[PDB]
Design a protein around this ligand. Structure first.
Ligand SMILES: Cc1nc2ccc(-c3cc(N)nc(N)c3)nc2n1C[C@H](C)Oc1cccc(Br)n1
Length: 333
């Protein structure tokens, strides 16, 4: 008799005379991931096991529908492929291609020194092409949980990547959750309790590309208030037209009589932490480690910093969209 929501995983057991369970290869809020051998297909698979709990089951039904939608608009370009799903022992089970480790593990492999600007640019091209495909009118899909941990290497030897975990994903106009995105990668509009569109994913990507090159999160807030303050340190006070609509503006800011917003009394002065110095543009890159190294020139750093600031625009209406981000000078050969 199953106790609560957990499937009890036993290694070596064979499910429906097809899946030979090998090991637990991951765990999350939604349940767990197992490495399994598919006898029929004669190959390795990762099976996401959804917890036998109603909230998680409903969200995983939306994951199957969106994964099926995306996989039907194919050949494969940058989204994890859903092979099939089935009910087993009262758990919904999602079968995926066996993949390599996540981009946070890749950073930990090189002691958080960071990947080269050349590798950062290859990850940025695949991510922007992926966000371009999500923005397709037939899809209009918001990932909502972009982070290094939901970006997987196909193979440890190459740089090809796939986006995984559409567990909190929604389509444009089907927002159902106030509280979304991992805090470090959480957009201003989500912190402010505002409605969101596909632009919140471009905000996550900006934060992610800086972290891959520096080896550290751009915005490492301990809580929502700390997170907002860390963003203001770099980007300054948000435009008044945005704060005037934000339900949670008075969680971090206060209106003055003359009608200008400032930070709640109780960090660097707003906008004084320059991305220019965080990238060490003129002083040899992150911790000065890329000094003189080929492909890390001041000119190369200026194009990258330019593209990142367009990704971190406070206005979702003027935040660079996937198509225009691919036309950026940071990508021309
Ligand atoms: C080796 C491998 N191939 C995979 C293929 C797909 C998935 C996967 C995982 C989740 N949460 N959602 C989807 N839609 C697909 N996960 C794979 N994994 C484990 C991966 C490295 O770890 C990960 C990655 C993310 C979450 C967790 Br826990 N662990």
């Amino acid at each position: 008799v199953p106790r609560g929501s957990h499937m009890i995983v036993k290694n070596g057991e064979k499910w429906m005379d097809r899946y030979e369970i090998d090991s637990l290869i991951g765990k999350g809020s939604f349940g767990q991931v197992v490495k399994a051998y598919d006898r029929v297909e004669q190959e390795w698979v990762a099976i996401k096991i959804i917890k036998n709990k109603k909230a998680f089951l409903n969200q995983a039904q939306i994951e199957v529908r969106l994964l099926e939608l995306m996989n039907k608009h194919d050949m494969k370009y940058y989204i994890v492929h859903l092979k099939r799903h089935f009910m087993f022992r009262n758990h919904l089970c999602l079968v995926f291609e066996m993949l390599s480790y996540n981009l946070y593990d890749l950073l930990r492999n090189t002691n958080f020194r960071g990947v080269s600007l050349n590798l950062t640019r290859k990850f940025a091209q695949q991510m922007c092409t992926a966000l371009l495909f999500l923005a397709t009118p037939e899809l209009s899909i918001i990932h909502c949980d972009l982070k290094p941990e939901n970006i997987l290497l196909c193979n440890p030897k190459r740089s090809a990547i796939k986006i995984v975990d559409f567990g909190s994903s929604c389509q444009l106009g089907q927002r159902i959750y106030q509280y979304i995105q991992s805090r470090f990668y959480r957009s201003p509009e989500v912190l402010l309790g505002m409605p969101y569109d596909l632009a919140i994913d471009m905000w996550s990507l900006g934060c992610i590309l800086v972290e891959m090159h520096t080896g550290e999160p751009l915005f490492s807030g301990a809580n929502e208030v700390d997170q907002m303050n860390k963003i203001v340190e770099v980007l300054g006070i948000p435009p008044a037209h945005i704060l005037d609509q934000a339900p949670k503006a008075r969680k971090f800011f206060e209106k003055l009589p003359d009608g200008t917003w400032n930070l709640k009394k109780t960090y660097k002065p707003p906008g004084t932490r320059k991305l220019h110095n965080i990238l060490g543009v003129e002083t040899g890159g992150p911790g000065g480690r890329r000094a003189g190294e080929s492909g890390h020139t001041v000119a190369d750093y200026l194009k990258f910093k330019d593209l990142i600031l367009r990704m971190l625009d406070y206005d979702p209406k003027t935040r660079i969209q996937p198509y225009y981000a691919l036309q950026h000078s940071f990508f021309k050969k």
